[PDB]
Design a protein around this ligand. Structure first.
Ligand SMILES: Cc1cc2nc3c(=O)[nH]c(=O)nc-3n(C[C@H](O)[C@H](O)[C@H](O)COP(=O)(O)OP(=O)(O)OC[C@H]3O[C@@H](n4cnc5c(N)ncnc54)[C@H](O)[C@@H]3O)c2cc1C
Ligand SMILES: O=c1[nH]c(=O)c2[nH]c(=O)[nH]c2[nH]1
Ligand code: FES
Ligand code: FES
Lengths: 1287, 98, 49
């Protein structure tokens, strides 16, 4: 047949014309309208698209349940299964326990990841109704969250295992019998045998093969037929590498490809067996068999721990991994090292090969003939005296690509320590999986001792050579890893031999070496959140300062919350796709659209010529809407295809062929310095007398520091719907933006109509973090033009790779410093030159450099000081606002030279920091007086609750006791000025209506992006009006209710809008006062109705401006900031000196948020900000080709913090008794100030590295401190041999 | 608007009240989430009632622009507006009449 | 109003009115209504929330 039949949330779906190119995600969202399931990346690394599949397993006669990424699942693979989405388990009328708990525990901020995480947790509970804490953590190896810092999710969910922010005793209990029935049709249908199916799409035919004979006949007649099993490699080839396989055969149903058979030599898995099945089978064998037989099994399991997450391993096949033949396969090196036996079949042939170097004859090739398929792989039992290890080092532990990955096996002559066989195999060291075949034979018959160690290491260093231009870079680190891995194996084998009781003594490990052999494990979390109870006399209805959950949390958990692309399309709505430059700097010589015009549904290609009024856009008017004559970065928007569907727009965009003539490009900071390519002139703040300060110093230290940039990775990408009204140029835009005002301006200017025609509406964003303060408009303006031109609604949601390329990120910084200080650690002179990489438009770059210079002091009084800033103009995507806005860069530099002051003086860092710290009433370098200076209290409380001095002793002791692991501990303060650097942006507005039923509709200029701003404004309105929060609603933000709004940024939005809201409420109260006096008890409803029937207005605006701001760079006078945020963090780490991996053991934060408006939300902002800073300083790295092309364009290569990344013991306290009278109800802003405090992890790492280096002086540690940089800085016999060629 | 030319009249009114051309003023629609608790457009009274409402809303804006007018008595409307904005003065107002 | 483009998922409503000036409703039979292609539901007083 040819009908596709499956179930969704218990309802039968019959699809008569299934297209093989259609994913489940697209089908759910566009065909069934179920928009709970989200698009976050399309490449399986984020989990936002996670759903559950149920099916009857014929081979086990049971119902099974597992999670999948809907973004990678072909609907044509889902015949006769049952899909469950977030909508299928509950809704706001009746939330599933999983939904209720994530919402009530403050586990949902922007909410965009929430459905995916719900479905991972839900799937776990269907397989294991009482999971362990470890199983719960593991459920989320494939789920990313950018907002929460993960702590509340795990803490709320911990309740399912085995004053308060939430009350777990009020959670409804879970009854597992009340889950949806397995559709009885699918049990009936399983009695009838499977027949072959054929589906025909616009480009692709898919055959679902039912028998081995069908499969092998097809491959004999059409060797071209492409096998698809899990689609976790082919889906990526099709979507990202523009590869097209016109004939696909899916053999997943065939029993012989799914069988598991025990043999005398090991366990055979059918090549279509999913990795989750391999894991479950090998886990049972490992548990029941003697250790001596399960060495290879445990190697495979160790690799599978770090292989993707649950969603990918549920569908990814063992055979798919083998035949993909990626250089960085984590399994192929293990199969190769163990000589796993592979069975290959064709119609009429059958052969066997033991995997070896020969199996992979070149880049992504195997020795399979075109008509052969892999039938099975036999994973061997280990023999007596046969030992195995597997290793993987990536950027991140969970769901990452290996940098180096290895399998290692040794077989000893029985009774001896003399080598009979040795196999060392590696991924990531060539264009295929390789064996160290020059090194290993030389060791046969040698004893397992120090000479063998040294011989192997020299062998590997010579044999695994990499050119300095090797693809992938990191050549020292990769080579170092091969030796470091071998060392760990060497030691592990000594330990295993020690257990054997041989007749002939092996080496014993010193106890200082023991920890080198440990398999990674983390203790369970221990979290503390401390905040202040509101006054006892406060009314129960006054919610200000109470931990009220985010108003949309329940809807976010249910997938009912509507994000831009969830809005239904109009019947006549079109799709847009941007066409971008593939050159850093070139003339456009021609554009040919002939191939685009042939794509079905193609409407038009828009270019500069199509713009009605002005092609000049951007904050400083130096940007093109569409490129004219020349392109100035890889990612510069040239045009936009308009077609009926996104798929058709994407195909047509590929048919737009641009010819270029290259022009000299300026890429790096140093290129710009050399070419005098800057945005405007030097910015400078200077105070006191530098020459005097330097000439009075005991010590002078110079240095340079590089700080990498950062991608926001909002889980919802940039998205605009533009709806033309057909009258007077009127247009309404639905946008994921922090900046409605500039969106409106930029659209109106481009079209040449007045602002009054253009309405921009924001309900919510799935994250912003500064990346939607301006760069959203490059999408908005393009869709607006399409809507105008066609007179039809048009929509565009950026794919992750497009978004990461086009929209820029945090500014990389280069700094040169010289610091002069006394023997006591007192700093007396400081000079810092800063350079930022701005990219190809000005945008916010100068203001960011201002804020860096305003924070170059961090927490420290420096009498003689000079900072300069220059913003480099380069041929890269324009960099922009990112949470902290230059603050974190400026402050890391301060903390960096401060760390070197402490080391140079030989005094404890905490003492050096404390004696240099400002005191109350001091002036900053920019002459602003510090009043209400709470930092000393944050510091003292943090020192005490962290038990800092005691733990310092414990770190010292660990370091004496461990040679190849080291711990570090550091406590860092921060001061962060609150208010826009541009004074007039410190304003906000509100509009309030009271309807005649007494309900209140409120709106303000602020946008919701997960920070709980609407929740806070409702809390403020309810106090101001003295009515319950239940009677007040905020529906959206829109330019036609509050005009001329500042972006939701600079952490200032609750301060500005809360005042606005308060004033509008005061106006309404003043108008009701006569009705309140005439009926002082009569309810709110009577006052309102009496006002209405007395013809008294029940609508009011409100407005606020922050007073007395205005700094001059010319005179170094005037206050840039209204007040400062203060806080302190103490962090402890443990590094692996041999791999560059580390654990975040414990972090303690004390933050001053004034009298919190909402301690749940403010603790969530501290944790969220802190974890983004952890990313910035230790994990996240963007890589560009020499010619300026961003290579890092998705979660596969850009590693944001995962559930497993966060401090194991994570303690957050809000400072008590610290009202801030000059912001709304004595609160303070919270969004950005905590981010920098993750530098405590950076400097703890630096301290651990110092301890490693002493085990074998001001060494370099740039940011981010990645595994590469950590490992390379732990200089030893291995690094020395790899770099210098000297043992 | 039901064909009686109410929006036209309100634009005429606002243009006199603000002393700017009708070309700079636009009415796009009527909505409960911009003006609440409205009487029906009925009793021939809608230009009387809404005219006054509009007039008052316009008078509030003019009052806020006065100091900018005083400093730049000739410089155009657009310069007063941008000056008010960059001085953090609200450019939104309600108006009401009974 | 009706010139506004339909959403892709938009449905149409038709009112069903009394053919008697004053009468008891003794029963309602929707059996023929249900057989019309595209029928979704028949709303009555019972459905009012
Ligand atoms: C988010 C994510 C994380 C990942 N993490 C890792 C990781 O950490 N380590 C790692 O090594 N890989 C990783 N992968 C890669 C991928 O998941 C694996 O290589 C997977 O095992 C491929 O199996 P599949 O069944 O999905 O193959 P498919 O994509 O269906 O096919 C893969 C290839 O194998 C062929 N094929 C499949 N079965 C047969 C057969 N029986 N005979 C012959 N040819 C066959 C196909 O024709 C195709 O060329 C990751 C992928 C994703 C999306
Ligand atoms: O002073 C600031 N101005 C901004 O425009 C901005 N945007 C942001 O994210 N933080 C800040 N800070
Ligand atoms: S959208 Fe599927 S994993 Fe990211
Ligand atoms: S709440 Fe998780 S990505 Fe925003």
């Amino acid at each position: 047949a040819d009908e596709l039949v499956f179930f969704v949330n218990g309802k039968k779906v019959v699809e008569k014309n299934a297209d093989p190119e259609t994913t489940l995600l697209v089908y759910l969202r566009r065909k069934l309208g179920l928009c709970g399931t989200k698009l976050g990346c399309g490449e399986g690394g984020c989990g936002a698209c996670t759903v559950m599949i149920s099916k009857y397993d014929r081979l086990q006669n049971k119902i099974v349940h597992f999670s999948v990424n809907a973004c990678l699942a072909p609907i044509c693979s889902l015949h006769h299964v049952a899909v469950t989405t977030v909508e299928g388990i509950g809704n706001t009328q009746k939330l599933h326990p999983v939904q209720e708990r994530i919402a009530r525990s403050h586990g949902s901020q922007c909410g965009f990841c929430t459905p995916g995480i719900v479905m991972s947790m839900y799937t776990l509970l269907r397989n294991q109704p009482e999971p362990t804490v470890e199983e719960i953590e593991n459920a989320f190896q494939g789920n990313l969250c950018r907002c929460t810092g993960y702590r509340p999710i795990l803490q709320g969910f911990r309740t399912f295992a085995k004053p308060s922010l939430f009350n777990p005793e009020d959670f409804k209990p879970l009854d597992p019998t009340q889950e949806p029935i397995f559709p009885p049709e699918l049990l009936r249908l399983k009695d009838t045998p499977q027949k072959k199916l054929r589906f025909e799409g616009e480009r692709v035919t898919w055959i679902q093969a039912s028998t081995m004979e069908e499969l092998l006949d097809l491959k004999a007649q059409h060797p071209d037929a492409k096998l698809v099993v899990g689609n976790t490699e082919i889906g990526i080839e099709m979507k990202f590498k523009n590869m097209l396989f016109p004939l696909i055969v899916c053999p997943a149903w065939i029993p012989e490809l799914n069988s598991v058979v025990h043999g005398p030599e090991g366990i055979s898995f059918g090549a279509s067996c999913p990795l989750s099945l391999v894991e479950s089978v090998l886990a049972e064998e490992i548990a029941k068999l003697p250790e001596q037989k399960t060495e290879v099994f445990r190697g495979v399991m160790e690799q599978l721990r770090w292989f993707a997450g649950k969603q990918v391993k549920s569908v990814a096949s063992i055979g798919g991994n083998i035949i993909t033949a990626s250089p960085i396969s984590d399994l192929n090196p293990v199969f190769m090292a163990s000589g796993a036996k592979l069975t290959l079949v064709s119609r009429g042939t059958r052969r066997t090969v033991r995997m070896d170097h020969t199996f992979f004859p070149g880049y992504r090739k195997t020795l399979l003939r075109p008509e052969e398929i892999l039938l099975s792989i036999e994973i061997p039992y280990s023999k007596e005296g046969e030992f195995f290890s597997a290793f993987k080092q990536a950027s991140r532990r969970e769901d990452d690509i290996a940098k180096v990955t290895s399998g290692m096996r040794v077989l000893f002559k029985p009774g001896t320590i003399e080598v009979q066989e040795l196999s060392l195999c590696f991924g990531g060291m060539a264009d295929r999986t390789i064996s160290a075949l020059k090194t290993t034979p030389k060791q046969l018959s040698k004893s397992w001792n120090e000479e063998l160690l040294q011989s192997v290491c020299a062998g590997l260093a010579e044999e695994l050579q990499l050119a300095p231009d090797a693809p992938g870079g990191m050549v020292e680190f990769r080579r170092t890893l091969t030796l470091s891995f071998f060392f760990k194996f060497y030691l592990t084998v000594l330990q295993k031999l020690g257990r054997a009781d041989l007749e002939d003594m092996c080496g014993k490990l010193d106890p200082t070496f023991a920890s080198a052999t440990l398999l990674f494990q983390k203790d369970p979390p221990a979290n503390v959140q401390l905040f202040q109870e509101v006054p006892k006399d406060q009314s129960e209805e006054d919610m200000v300062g109470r931990p009220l959950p985010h108003l949309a949390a329940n809807m976010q958990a249910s997938g009912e919350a509507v994000y831009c692309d969830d809005i239904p399309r109009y019947e006549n709505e079109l799709s847009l796709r941007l066409v971008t430059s593939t050159r850093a700097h070139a003339k456009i010589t021609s554009i040919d659209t002939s191939e685009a015009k042939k794509v079905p549904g193609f409407v038009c290609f828009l270019t500069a010529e199509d713009v009605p009024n002005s092609n000049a856009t951007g904050l400083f008017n130096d940007e093109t809407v569409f490129a004219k004559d020349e392109v100035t970065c890889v990612g510069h928007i040239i045009g936009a295809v308009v077609a009926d569907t996104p798929e058709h727009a994407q195909r047509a965009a590929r048919g737009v062929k641009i010819t270029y003539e290259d022009l000299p490009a300026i890429i790096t900071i140093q290129d710009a310095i050399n070419n005098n390519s800057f945005y405007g002139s030097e910015i400078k703040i200077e105070k006191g007398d530098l020459k005097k300060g330097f000439s009075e110093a005991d010590n002078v230290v110079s240095g340079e520091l590089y700080i990498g940039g950062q991608e926001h990775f909002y889980l919802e990408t940039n998205c605009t719907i533009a709806v033309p009204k057909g009258e007077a140029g009127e247009m309404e835009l639905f946008v994921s933006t922090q900046n409605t005002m500039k969106t409106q301006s930029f659209v109106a200017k481009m079209l040449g109509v007045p602002d009054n025609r253009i309405v921009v509406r924001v309900k919510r964003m799935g994250g912003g973090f500064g990346g939607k303060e301006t760069r959203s408009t490059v999408v908005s303006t393009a869709l607006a033009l399409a809507a105008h031109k066609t007179g039809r609604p048009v929509r565009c949601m950026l794919d992750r790779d497009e978004d990461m390329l086009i929209t820029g990120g945090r500014h990389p910084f280069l700094a040169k410093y010289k610091v002069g200080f006394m023997k006591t650690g007192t700093v007396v002179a400081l000079e810092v030159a800063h350079f930022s990489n701005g990219g190809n438009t000005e945008d916010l770059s100068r203001s960011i450099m201002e804020r860096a210079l305003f924070h170059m002091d961090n927490a420290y009084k420096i009498p003689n000081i000079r900072g300069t800033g220059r913003i480099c103009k380069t041929n890269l995507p324009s960099n922009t606002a990112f949470r902290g806005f230059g603050g974190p860069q400026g402050m890391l530099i301060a903390e960096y030279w401060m760390s070197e002051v402490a080391i140079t003086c030989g005094l404890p860092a905490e003492e050096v920091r404390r004696k240099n710290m400002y005191k109350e009433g001091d002036l900053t370098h920019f002459n602003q007086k510090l009043e209400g200076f709470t930092l000393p209290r944050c510091w003292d409380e943090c020192i005490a609750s962290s038990q800092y001095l005691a733990r310092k002793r414990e770190v010292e002791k660990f370091n004496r006791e461990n040679c190849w692991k080291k711990r570090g501990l550091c406590i860092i303060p921060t001061k962060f000025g609150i208010s826009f650097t541009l004074p007039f942006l410190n304003q906000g507005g509100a509009l309030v209506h009271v309807y005649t039923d007494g309900s209140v509709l409120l709106t303000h200029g602020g946008t919701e992006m997960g920070q709980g701003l609407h929740t806070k404004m409702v809390q403020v309105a309810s106090r101001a009006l003295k009515i319950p929060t239940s009677k007040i609603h905020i529906s959206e933000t829109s330019t036609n209710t509050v005009p001329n709004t500042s972006p939701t940024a600079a952490s200032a939005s609750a301060d500005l809008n809360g005042q606005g809201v308060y004033e509008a409420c005061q106006t309404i109260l003043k108008r009701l006062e006569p009705f309140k006096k005439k009926k002082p008890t009569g309810p709110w409803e009577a006052w309102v109705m009496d006002a209405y029937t007395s013809a008294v207005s029940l609508s009011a605006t409100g407005f606020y401006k922050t007073p007395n701001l205005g700094y001059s760079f010319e005179t170094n006078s005037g206050n840039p900031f209204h007040y400062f945020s203060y806080g302190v963090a103490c962090s402890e780490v443990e590094i692996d000196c041999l791999t560059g991996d580390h654990k975040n053991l414990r972090t303690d934060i004390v933050m001053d948020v004034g009298s919190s408006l909402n301690p749940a939300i403010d603790i969530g902002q501290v944790e969220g900000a802190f974890v983004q800073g952890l990313g910035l300083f230790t994990m996240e790295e963007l890589h560009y080709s020499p010619e300026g092309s961003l290579h890092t364009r998705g979660p596969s290569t850009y590693k944001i913090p995962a559930f497993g990344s966060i401090p194991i013991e994570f303690r957050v306290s809000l400072l008590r008794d610290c009202p801030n009278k000059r912001a709304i109800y004595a609160s303070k802003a919270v969004g950005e100030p905590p981010l920098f405090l993750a530098s405590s992890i950076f400097f703890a790492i630096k301290d651990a590295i110092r301890a490693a280096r002493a085990q074998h002086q001001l060494f370099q540690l740039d940011s981010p401190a990645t595994p590469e940089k950590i490992r390379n800085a732990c200089v030893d016999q291995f690094t020395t041999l790899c770099v210098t060629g000297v043992p």
